[PDB]
């Protein structure tokens, strides 16, 4: 896709010189971005490990210092 072409052009040109800190900067904000997405319906599990489907609605709450850290990343 066109989204896959814009990522591959920056990871081919910059990877010719930056052999130390390229795989760290791109893979950094993934621990933060999984805390902003709302939950609308989830899979849960019982006490014994058996699957259940539960459709609660849980709103994502994020402080103002995470967005001041995601801007730094």
């Amino acid at each position: 896709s066109h989204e896959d072409y814009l990522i591959a052009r920056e990871l081919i040109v910059l990877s010719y010189s930056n052999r130390s800190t390229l795989a760290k900067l791109v893979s950094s904000p993934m621990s933060i971005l999984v805390a902003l997405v709302d939950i609308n319906g989830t899979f849960i599990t019982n006490e014994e490990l058996e699957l259940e489907f539960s459709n609660k609605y849980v709103r994502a709450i994020v402080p103002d210092q995470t967005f001041d850290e995601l801007k730094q990343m």
Partner: protein, 781 residues
């Protein structure tokens, strides 16, 4: 997309509270030169009230259309609370430092003080114009300058505010009574609010449209909305018994073969933990929203029929649809009951008025099995009104779990019978299927008490009137998944945490107030566009908007005819008291805003006889008839509607006195030779030649001192005389000492919106949680 109907419910916010920042004004003072009784110009000016942005359209019908648009403008401008300390500007020139209440009020105080011809008794009146602040009762008195029409609109916004005081004994009365008085929930609070805390109360009164009566395509999409929202609230089961440790226990009682527990008997099919949680959710959420359920099952399953005797003895029979309640009641008779006693099988034909559990209590003779078969027929919701909300409760022998002691006394004797019609292999497969329920006599009294407690509690959080009407589309319940709930549950109690009860309550309040505040905004335009006599406007575009502000409805689904039936019920309702008194104040003086304009004139009178011009102090000499008497009237609105110009053609040719009446534009001149040459009688000749009357511009003469060729009037002794004259009014005079008004309000509020954000509730330990009686739910080991 059942995850998008739920997102339309948590995205309904409460009503946007408005506070006004400037005063509502419709007139403004204006300086005009004055002329004496002779016509000569005085060396002074005088202040007259004039309209602000006078845009009056022509024709008598477009003036009625203008005041419906003004009534929409005032209704979107009235505040819910008003503090006069916000709108306050410093008075420039007073005895001490005072504050008038608006910036426009301070502009027309400074414009009279720095004037040159203003007498001193008005200039002294601005110096003693300040505020008075009472502190023990927090009120203030801020002076104003307003029109007496503006004084009526701005005093009604003050005396009628939507704010009530707030305490700690009134936050606890916001919580429902069945939850606050519950034993399992401990309710705490942290802060105590001051005496100046205020809050706005929603209007929770039941629906006046009766949308369950003959509106069956609008009720089906308004009870699917309450079915998905009630499904995201009822708690899900944790600590279920594991499936592999349950089928292996179940495969020793049936004596199955090795490796083929799923193919030898069809008893053990669809037993998961996914379908145990699915059935507990869809039985609680179908009763809280009155969606009719529907059963699916396979007749070759002897275990889906024994666990289908437990639904019909617990859930009332008026919820299942009749083409599937009968087919489930008949398959129990022809398999479990009638081959147990040895009688002939049922010859049941379609469309019979009696259900198979109602014929078979007459043809059966056993006493223990005709008591259970009698409780199934007479199991009904008992409609009771609690806290002004009609909600339908269960029987008192289903909250207790006493009904299971009637079920497992009936199928304990039905396992005892010897029946000769069936072989010895048909006896052994039913007698072993019916034993797996009798081994769960303890854990089905603890399951009937758990549905009846998670339905008693979540019923206390609803506010809308739940009515029991059969719906179009049925929400499906698989009878396989009731078997996976009866023989998979454990002795662990789940009760809904109070941060869910305070959120299921706060969605049902924000939807029941958004419903009611859209009825009152559509009754108030329907009743206003019939009192104002708008015979040409069609009301399809003010119910199409009403279905849109309700967030759950679609417009491309509803037809034209289901929109003109909804406005035949919107008329019969009375309009709200705040919307009526802001409309009776427009309708009382809708001829004082129309008559005080310069882009319009109220029709011409013609008499073909020289009459004197009326001398005013602001126009010099002007031909104005302030009253219309002694003349025949011809309504222009009824002349353009029918197009019959026979009466006005025979009267213009014959030179007879007429008085045309209607909202009419006009042009003005100032010459004197334009009066001697009689340019006023030559306008109406066009009506004879061309039929149209939309081109009519009468002449309004104005013989001042600054008019050219005025020395014709002052030298020769004559008063000016004209043939025709215009029905027009004269603008009022601006008296500064009689237009001041002291506007009174409070000093300080503090308005809160989310009242249940102050309490901090907590559940008791769930192993000790009591039912409606003294004992605890899920007590039997």
């Amino acid at each position: 997309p059942k995850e998008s109907i739920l997102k339309k419910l948590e995205d309904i916010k409460p009503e946007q509270v408005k506070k006004q920042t400037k005063l509502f004004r419709i007139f403004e003072p204006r300086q005009l030169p004055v002329y004496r009784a002779n016509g000569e110009k005085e060396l002074r000016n005088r202040w007259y009230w004039k309209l602000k942005r006078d845009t009056l359209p022509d024709g008598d019908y477009d003036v009625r259309e203008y005041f419906l648009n003004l009534y929409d403008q005032v209704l979107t401008e009235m505040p819910d609370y008003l503090l006069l300390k916000d709108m306050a500007v410093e008075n420039k020139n007073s005895r001490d430092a005072g504050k008038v209440v608006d910036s426009e009020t301070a502009a027309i105080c400074d414009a009279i003080f720095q004037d040159e011809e203003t007498e001193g008794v008005v200039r002294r009146f601005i110096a003693e114009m300040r505020q008075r602040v009472q502190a023990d009762r927090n009120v203030v008195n801020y002076p104003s300058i307003l029109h007496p029409i503006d004084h009526a609109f701005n005093e009604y916004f003050l005396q009628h505010q939507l704010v009530e005081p707030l305490n700690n004994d009134i936050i606890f009365n916001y919580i429902p009574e069945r939850i606050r008085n519950d034993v399992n929930y401990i309710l705490n609070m942290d802060r105590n609010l001051p005496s100046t805390a205020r809050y706005i109360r929603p209007n929770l009164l039941q629906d006046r449209l009766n949308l369950h009566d003959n509106f069956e395509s609008l009720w089906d999409t308004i009870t699917t909305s309450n079915y998905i929202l009630a499904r995201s609230v009822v708690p899900d089961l944790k600590e279920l018994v594991s499936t592999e440790a349950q089928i292996q226990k179940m495969s020793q009682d049936l004596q199955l073969e090795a490796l083929t527990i799923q193919s030898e008997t069809q008893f053990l099919t669809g037993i998961n933990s996914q379908a145990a949680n699915d059935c507990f959710k869809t039985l609680i959420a179908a009763m809280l929203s009155q969606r009719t359920m529907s059963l699916d099952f396979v007749t070759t399953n002897y275990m889906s029929l024994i666990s289908g005797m437990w639904l019909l003895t617990v859930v009332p029979n008026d919820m299942f649809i009749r083409e599937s309640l009968v087919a489930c009641q008949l398959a129990i008779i022809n398999t479990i009951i009638y081959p147990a006693f040895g009688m002939q099988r049922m010859h049941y034909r379609n469309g019979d008025p009696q259900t198979p559990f109602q014929i078979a209590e007459q043809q059966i003779q056993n006493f223990q099995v005709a008591n259970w078969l009698h409780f199934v027929n007479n199991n009904q919701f008992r409609q009771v009104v609690i806290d002004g909300v009609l909600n339908q409760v269960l029987n008192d022998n289903i909250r207790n779990g006493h009904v299971v002691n009637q079920l497992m006394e009936a199928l304990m004797q039905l396992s005892r019978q010897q029946f000769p019609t069936m072989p010895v292999d048909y006896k052994r497969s039913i007698q072993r299927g019916i034993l797996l329920l009798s081994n769960r006599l303890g854990q089905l009294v603890d399951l009937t008490r758990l549905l009846a407690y998670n339905y008693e509690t979540l019923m206390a959080c609803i506010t809308m009137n739940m009515q029991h009407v059969q719906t179009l589309t049925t929400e499906k319940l698989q009878l396989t998944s009731v078997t996976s709930l009866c023989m998979l549950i454990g002795n662990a109690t789940v009760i809904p945490s109070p941060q869910t009860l305070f959120h299921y309550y706060n969605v049902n309040v924000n939807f029941h107030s958004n419903y009611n505040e859209r009825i009152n905004d559509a009754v108030a335009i329907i009743t206003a566009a019939n009192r104002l006599n708008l015979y040409q406007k069609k009301m399809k575009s003010i119910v199409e908007d009403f279905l849109k502000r309700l967030q759950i409805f679609d417009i491309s689904r509803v037809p034209d005819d289901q929109m003109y039936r909804l406005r035949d019920r919107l008329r019969l309702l009375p309009v709200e008291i705040r919307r009526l008194d802001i409309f009776n104040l427009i309708l009382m003086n809708m001829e004082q805003i129309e008559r005080a304009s310069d882009k319009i004139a109220q029709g011409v009178i013609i008499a073909y006889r020289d009459m004197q011009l009326e001398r005013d102090e602001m126009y010099g000499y002007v031909n104005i008839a302030r009253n219309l008497d002694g003349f025949q009237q011809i309504n222009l609105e009824e002349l353009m509607r029918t197009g019959d110009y026979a009466q006005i053609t025979n009267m213009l040719l014959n030179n007879q006195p007429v008085a045309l009446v209607g909202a009419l534009p006009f042009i003005t001149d100032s010459s004197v030779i334009s009066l001697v040459a009689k340019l006023d009688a030559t306008v109406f000749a066009q009506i004879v030649k061309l039929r149209k009357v939309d081109t009519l511009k009468p002449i309004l003469y104005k013989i001042n001192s600054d008019s050219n060729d005025f020395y014709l009037v002052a030298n020769y002794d004559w008063v000016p005389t004209s043939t025709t004259k215009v029905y027009k009014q004269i603008p009022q005079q601006f008296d500064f000492r009689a237009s001041m008004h002291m506007l009174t309000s409070n000093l300080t509020f503090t308005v809160y919106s989310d009242l249940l954000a102050f309490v901090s509730a907590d559940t008791v330990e769930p192993i000790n949680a009591v039912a409606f009686d003294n004992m605890r739910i899920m007590n039997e080991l």
